[PDB]
Paper text:
Here, we report sub-particle cryoEM reconstructions of HCMV virions at 2.9 Å resolution revealing structures resembling non-coding transfer RNAs (tRNAs) associated with the virion’s capsid-bound tegument protein, pp150. Based on our models, tRNA recruitment is mediated by the electrostatic interactions between tRNA phosphate groups and the helix-loop-helix motif of HCMV pp150. The DNA confining hexon channel is “secured” from the outside by β-herpesvirus-specific tegument protein pp150, whose N-terminal one-third (pp150nt) is resolved.
Each L-shaped density interacts with three pp150 subunits atop a triplex: one at the corner of the L, and one at each of the two arms of the L. Each arm of the L-shaped density has a 2.3 nm width and has coaxial double helices, which are the defining feature of nucleic acid. The atomic model consists of four leaflets—acceptor stem (1–8 and 65–71 nt), D-arm (9–26 nt), anticodon arm (27–43 nt), and T-arm (48–64 nt). Among the three, pp150nt-a has the most extensive interactions with the tRNA, binding to both the T-arm (at 25 Gln, 26 Lys and 34 His, 39 Lys, and 40 Lys) and the loop of the D-arm (9 Gln and 11 Arg). pp150nt-b interacts with the phosphate groups in the base-stacked region of the anticodon arm (at 22 His, 26 Lys, and 36 Lys). These interactions only involve the phosphate groups, which introduce less selectivity than base-stacked groups during the recruitment of tRNA, indicating that pp150 could bind to different types of tRNA as shown by the sequencing data. We found that cryoEM densities of tRNAs on the Tb, Td, and Te have the highest resolution, whereas the tRNA on Ta has a much weaker density, not observable at a higher threshold.
Residue numbers in the entry:
A (entry chain 5), B (entry chain 6), C (entry chain 4): 1 to 285
Write the structure that this text describes.
Amino acid sequence: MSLQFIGLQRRDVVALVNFLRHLTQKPDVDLEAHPKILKKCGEKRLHRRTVLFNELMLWLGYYRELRFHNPDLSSVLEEFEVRCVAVARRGYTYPFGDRGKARDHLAVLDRTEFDTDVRHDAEIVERALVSAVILAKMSVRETLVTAIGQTEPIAFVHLKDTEVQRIEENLEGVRRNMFCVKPLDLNLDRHANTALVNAVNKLVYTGRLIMNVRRSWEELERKCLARIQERCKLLVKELRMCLSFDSNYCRNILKHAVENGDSADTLLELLIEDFDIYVDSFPQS
Amino acid sequence: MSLQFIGLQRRDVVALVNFLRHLTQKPDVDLEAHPKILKKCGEKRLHRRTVLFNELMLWLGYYRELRFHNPDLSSVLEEFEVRCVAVARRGYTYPFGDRGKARDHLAVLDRTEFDTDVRHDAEIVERALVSAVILAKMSVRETLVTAIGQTEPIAFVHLKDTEVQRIEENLEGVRRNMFCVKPLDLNLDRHANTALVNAVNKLVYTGRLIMNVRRSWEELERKCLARIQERCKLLVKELRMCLSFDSNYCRNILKHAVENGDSADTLLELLIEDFDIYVDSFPQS
Amino acid sequence: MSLQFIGLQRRDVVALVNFLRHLTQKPDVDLEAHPKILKKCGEKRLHRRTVLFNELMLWLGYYRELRFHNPDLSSVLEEFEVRCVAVARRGYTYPFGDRGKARDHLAVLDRTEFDTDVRHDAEIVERALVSAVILAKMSVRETLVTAIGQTEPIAFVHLKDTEVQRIEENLEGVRRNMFCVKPLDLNLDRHANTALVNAVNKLVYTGRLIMNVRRSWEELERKCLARIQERCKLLVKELRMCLSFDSNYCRNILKHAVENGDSADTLLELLIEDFDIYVDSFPQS
RNA sequence: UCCCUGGUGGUCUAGUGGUUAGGAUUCGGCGCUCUCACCGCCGCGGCCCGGGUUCGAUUCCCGGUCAGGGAACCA
């Protein structure tokens, strides 16, 4: 439906709705990143119960938008598979000091594939990148870290400081707004470096992209669910004070547990559809 | 260049000219769906000759507009192929009762590519959809059509009835206005369904969209050509009724049969170019 | 900007500094080609010593601009190396009448590398091109120069006359203004001569582009050095006419030899810095 | 090489620190007329993008944008 707020003026309702409609465009797509939108809720200007209801509705709409856009990186996954295979071939051609030890990493790179679950996908990419970078480091005769518990740093190899700085800025930017992805003019491939190194660096860039998108989204969803649950519990603590028909009705709506954004959809739709019945409880303005 | 209408007042003429451009952005893009525009032609008010001439002009302009817009779906089938590869990617590791059947379907799914011909595109979509629905149904251990000559019906799996109604209505709207497609408010993803089931639902939706656009265009072109061909025969009889220079000239223009889209364009251009020479024939007001 | 002119008006100094600022944008990047600037530098109207000093300043500025805007053919150099590797790849496979001769020339093609120095680049490209052209001549059974103290000329083999004309015009243009390198021409046909011949032809084009750029730049530098030396000598005579402290200071500044553009920058800074103490010797207005 | 303007529905466009952003406008439907030209009727319908200023701004500052004006070699 359309979000229903208790005490907000039209000026604030339109702003809260415009922040949601345009959530993709804004950099730093995080509700907390914008304290002004939370201020539009009526905190310190409205009754506490109305403020809690407003924040619950806001977080529900925000979580709904988040799940709706929900970037599916089908083509990035396609590219990661290709680049993983390319790293494997360039490695198998290359001659190593200990072909056995490089064989473990070439095998880990061959057995890599995407599972049915997506979170597994983020973990898969990370574990593959570790081996790929280890291989590239061995190729240049650099000494990889062998301290136990200091597995490995995923990093580009034989790239000038400027390029690494630009690429890190790009990946951080994707971290802030996952929904919008920008192509890179700067090219990781360099004529000086070995072809194995160039393949490794391209695979590393794509894997960092996948990992950042997936992890950032999962964290946003976790935070949204936690905020929603806090708001539900506190609002119920408040509504339990008055035993009116409509107050009991609002609590009865809120009884549902809000885990599993499927529950979020059901809760939001139940809130909106029966709004006229329980709205008299909250004190407007 | 502009269409020429014998009897009408400049007002109605401006109305028809506005209609032709508005066609691109309108629900129900079909001339016969709008009785008012056709009646505005001058039916039963003017002489039958003039009504026939005006209707022929309107149908020629309408066909010109449809053929000119004529949506191109190259992006959409390119997206369909990626949707297939994503379905396959989620399908591979899932444990199946008969890996032989699952692997055959995953292979049919991967090798899917679109031909340059459009009709081949419709057949491709149908085959890929049958294969993907079979894979998803097997994933959930539901029974399938074992009969000979029978094939599984294309349907969404593990979706609420209300969501199915919503998407059915949306695809109906796409059928009404093939040029403009409205993004659906709903998202096909569900937390209960696995990644494979969600991928299959999205693939089903995009394939349904493709075939709907294709069939709608086919029917529209068929009706346009039939209506034009009827108007020409009727008008030729009416003109044969009267022997004059302008009447004979218009009949001579109407001799060559328009059974094509280019034949219609030639007819429209020739019938416009000589409007002044033969106009006097048709009685006005 | 830093350039100091004795007797010029504000507008003419602005014109000279603007001409140097916009140097690369103008076609025919050569001062001698642009007469209006050189005449405006000083003039017949101004005194001889003043004219000589003004020409010294203009030439020093022009040399500084040339040396700052020298070309950095990093990408073209990498491309030449890639095409050399390609010619070597297709040389070993091709069946030859006497493979020993081919193997000598292939060995020569295989060592080719670019040192840090830009001056070495033309010498490297020439050796590589001679070897490749001999290889292509052997492949097609052409007669190759065998005379004592004679070398094969670098030319395209089995190319159309029109394509040769187009490329020769492009290379003449590059000779005109080198800072602009736009090598966009790859018109070879696979059904044409053969893989070896085509690879050799592309290599020839890139080598010609590099050699032309380098030679044109070096010629400009040589002319600048000649002009600067002549200005210094004539001015030193004119100043030797008078034995003032100021004239002695101006002479002592002009002792520095302007070969080795580093010396040119030394002279430019020395003139600009201490202008106050010796400007009195120069008559102005 | 310089500065100077502007973006407000479906074009065109007034406003112009808290306003449910308003105009003709087409559109659609009321067709009440030979056709509606009367629209006599509504209704849908819109904040250049992002950040930043206070209690709160499309409406103020800073960047980016796209369209423009006139200023640089030629001008």
